[PDB]
């Protein structure tokens, strides 16, 4: 199989937005990518660390806690509404004018 | 799989709790009796000891050493340490008036 052209930021955004509640955790993101891309069955630690770094680095994602402790084993990340669309018009690979807080 | 292993200081606290809860004598009786007979040999030869006398001596000695170790632990903690050093015992005896 071939590597998808889609950048990890676009993959995370689509995974977050595709849920009925517009919200998913890291485990559910792993479930979605496993279901919809057989290619990523290899280089597991590589792409796992890559997406974790992307989540901790990109400013278009912000974390939210769990009120009654939830099932737990990890926190939850909300998409930043102010970022809007960034990968629109087919440019899934290299976004222009990245979102920034400052 | 590596075997279980407590970190340093945990079993020390367990031993502190165990030996502060209990009351039995901590020194082996027979070596202490031999020591008592040895020391008394200098003052008078061919002495006999009532068993009660040896038990009283052991009780007094253990109580004295326990109190001394309380004082020396306080002395060590005063110097911002956890390990009791011989200088701590020396200071405790000096303040008590034994030295």
């Amino acid at each position: 199989h071939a590597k998808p052209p889609y950048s990890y930021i676009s993959l995370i955004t689509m995974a977050i937005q595709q849920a009925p509640s517009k919200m998913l955790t890291l485990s559910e993101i792993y479930q979605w990518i496993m279901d919809l891309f057989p290619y990523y069955r290899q280089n597991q630690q590589r792409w796992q660390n890559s997406i974790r770094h992307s989540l901790s680095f990109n400013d278009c994602f912000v974390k939210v806690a769990r009120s009654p402790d939830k099932p737990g084993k990890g926190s939850y990340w909300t998409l930043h509404p102010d970022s809007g669309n960034m990968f629109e018009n087919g440019c899934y690979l290299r976004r222009q004018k990245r979102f920034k807080c400052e | 799989k590596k075997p279980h292993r407590y970190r340093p200081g945990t079993v020390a606290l367990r031993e502190i709790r165990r030996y502060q809860k209990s009351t039995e004598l901590l020194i082996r009786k027979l070596p202490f009796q031999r020591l008592v007979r040895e020391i008394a040999q200098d003052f008078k030869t061919d002495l006999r000891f009532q068993s009660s006398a040896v038990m009283a001596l052991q009780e007094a000695c253990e109580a004295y050493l326990v109190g001394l170790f309380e004082d020396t632990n306080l002395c060590a903690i005063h110097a911002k340490r956890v390990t009791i050093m011989p200088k701590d015992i020396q200071l405790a005896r000096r303040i008590r008036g034994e030295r």
Binding site: - | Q20, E38, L47, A53, A56, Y64
Partner: protein
């Protein structure tokens, strides 16, 4: 019949247990010789007083009351063995 080096009979685990009852968490390696010396001095004093009491009574057996009186003379009164 003669006794030579029984001070070493107060082994390292025994001194360690005595320290543990005193609330000591960590013990230096040189504490044990120091503790043996201190214990020997204390025993020598108490036994000297007790044997003096025994000799005064013209006995040959060191009774428990002799040790009790000897300890009381040091200001270390002991309850449980008479007196």
């Amino acid at each position: 019949k003669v006794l030579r080096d029984n001070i070493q009979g107060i082994t390292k685990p025994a001194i360690r247990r005595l320290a543990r009852r005193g609330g000591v968490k960590r013990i230096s390696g040189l504490i044990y010789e120091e503790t043996r010396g201190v214990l020997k001095v204390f025993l020598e004093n108490v036994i000297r007083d007790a044997v003096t009491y025994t000799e005064h009574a013209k006995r040959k057996t060191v009774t428990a009351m002799d040790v009790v009186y000897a300890l009381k003379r040091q200001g270390r009164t002991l309850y449980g063995f008479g007196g």
